[PDB]
């Protein structure tokens, strides 16, 4: 609007080996949007006003008003901020994380951000912090001004469980969260800057090769999107994504179990996002066959969990599964 030019251009997108097709961008009043959510397919909603009061947020406003709580800030010497569960690192002591978590005050995050910009350093930062009671007064008022009427009615219409968390995300241009899926429904509310989102449906599990359930990187893809090892991950040559770029005011529905790869646009400045994580609807009373892909994903996860428990050691899960299949099911 106002003829301010192209918000972004394709030069700012990283290059990958797979094709994509676009996620629909719709008005929340469009019946097709309702259709996509009800069928757990991704959609970008352009006019929800979900986080309208937060669109004025920048680092200055937040430092002044977000309080003096602790904020988890991840640091990496690479653009890939691969998520890992610190609590599972015991199971895989040969795993050396490439990003480190550091607690700090918000003004320390801005200052550390400022230093890196001055020194031209290569270090990268990504703040990822659940919002909680410790936020300042004006942030509380903004939070209350979110469109709870709209999102509460979505939660009720879809039979979802409780809102578990709102994750505040502040990243540097070029930051990447590698492909993974979450076990909760997500309304991904973009606030500042532009994020390219590439989603893959649950039925491409075979092409994306998640880590073992007991690995710290459970639910994350093993494939290095920047250099896919096609000999270890041959079916990654069959992956096809759903792509969009969200900017301030957009809300992307990331359905539960859907893989997503998220990157802050190159040379786009900092990005700010707040997500809305809801527990999924319960498993229905009557089961309809054939099962959906995501039901099979749930089954596979539980098989891995139970074997790790029964065998008394996650390291024995792999060997037992191979014993099961070799010359029997393959």
């Amino acid at each position: 609007a106002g003829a301010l030019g192209p918000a972004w251009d394709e030069s700012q997108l990283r290059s990958y080996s797979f094709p994509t097709r676009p996620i629909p961008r719709l008005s929340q009043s469009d019946p097709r949007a309702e259709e996509l959510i009800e069928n757990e397919e991704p959609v970008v909603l352009t006019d929800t006003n979900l986080v309208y009061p937060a669109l004025k947020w920048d680092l200055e406003y937040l430092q002044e008003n977000i309080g003096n709580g602790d904020f988890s800030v991840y640091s990496a010497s690479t653009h890939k901020f691969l998520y890992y569960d610190e609590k599972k690192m015991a199971n895989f002591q040969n795993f050396k994380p490439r990003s480190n978590r550091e607690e700090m005050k918000f003004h320390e995050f801005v200052e550390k951000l400022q230093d890196i910009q001055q020194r031209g350093g290569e270090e990268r930062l990504y703040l990822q912090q659940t919002l909680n009671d410790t936020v300042g007064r004006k942030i509380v008022m903004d939070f209350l001004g979110f469109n709870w009427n709209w999102i509460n009615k979505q939660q009720g219409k879809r039979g979802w469980g409780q809102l578990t968390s709102n994750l505040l995300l502040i990243g540097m241009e070029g930051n990447v969260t590698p492909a993974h899926y979450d076990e909760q429904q997500n309304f991904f509310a973009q606030i500042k800057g532009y994020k390219r989102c590439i989603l893959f449906p649950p039925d491409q599990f075979e092409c994306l090769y998640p880590y073992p359930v007991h690995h710290p990187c459970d639910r994350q893809s093993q494939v290095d999107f920047d250099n896919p090892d096609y000999e270890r991950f041959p079916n990654f040559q069959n992956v096809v994504g759903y792509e969009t770029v969200v900017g301030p005011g957009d809300v992307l529905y990331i359905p539960m179990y859907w893989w997503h790869h998220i990157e802050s646009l190159l040379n786009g400045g900092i990005t700010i996002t707040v997500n809305f994580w809801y527990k999924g609807a319960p498993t229905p009373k009557r089961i309809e066959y054939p099962l959906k892909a995501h039901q099979k994903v749930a089954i596979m996860r539980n098989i891995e969990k139970m074997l790790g428990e029964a065998l008394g050691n996650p390291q024995e899960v792999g060997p037992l599964l191979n014993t099961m299949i070799k010359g029997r099911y393959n």
């Binding site: 988890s72 998520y83 569960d85 610190e86 609590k87 978590r101 990822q128 659940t130 578990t164 968390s165 994750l167 969260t177 993974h180 979450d182 076990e183 909760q184 459970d218 639910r219 539960m256 994580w277 527990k279 999924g280 498993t283 089961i287 039901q295 749930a298 089954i299 996860r301 539980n302 098989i303």
Partner: peptide, 18 residues
């Protein structure tokens, strides 16, 4: 009992627990 045991979903997300 067993079929619903295997179909039961978790709720893990990309947010570190304390």
């Amino acid at each position: 009992e067993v079929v619903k045991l295997l179909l039961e979903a978790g709720a893990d997300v990309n947010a570190q627990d304390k």
